Design a protein around this nucleic acid. Structure first.
Ligand SMILES: [Mg+2]
Ligand SMILES: [Mg+2]
Ligand SMILES: [Mg+2]
Length: 89
RNA sequence: GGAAAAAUAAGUAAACCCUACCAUUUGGAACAACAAGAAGUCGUAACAAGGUAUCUGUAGGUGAACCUGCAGAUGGAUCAUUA
């Protein structure tokens, strides 16, 4: 029985050195578009909203943003460092 | 008669305040650039018909260059086709 907030931050290879930072497990209650906007400007990126398995909304930024983001979430109290997991490879 | 102090009226007017400014410097909360360089980030606007020809004025949109509307210029990729 898990209702708590856990956030998975992926880094996926696009082509060559270029990549993706995929933010997964943002609670549905937050307007994703505002985070889209503010992140595009904050990080200087293009980014997208992606629909998975009919319920799951993920954020896809170009380039590797993980620490910037984890900091954004802790600072904005969307999570504790324990609930934010960062998988890079 | 002469004449010092002391007083008197008007003037010259230093200095010190109050108002409003000018000049030459200067302290300063708060804002805050620019040029140069290159092994940071996102993309690839422009050079070739840069891959949607560019570019000017304007107006709107917008992570970013930029994009789109209207009128314009070849500095164009056309000096050129009535039968
Ligand atoms: Mg003065
Ligand atoms: Mg520079
Ligand atoms: Mg404008």
């Amino acid at each position: 029985d898990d209702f708590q907030t856990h956030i998975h931050i992926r880094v996926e290879q696009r082509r060559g050195r270029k990549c993706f930072t995929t933010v997964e497990g943002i609670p549905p209650e937050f307007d994703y578009e505002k985070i889209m906007k503010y992140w595009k400007k904050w990080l200087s990126c293009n980014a997208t909203i992606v629909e998975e398995d009919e319920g799951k909304k993920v954020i896809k930024l170009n380039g590797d943003h993980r620490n910037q983001i984890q900091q954004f979430l802790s600072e904005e109290g969307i999570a504790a460092v324990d609930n934010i997991t960062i998988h890079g490879i």
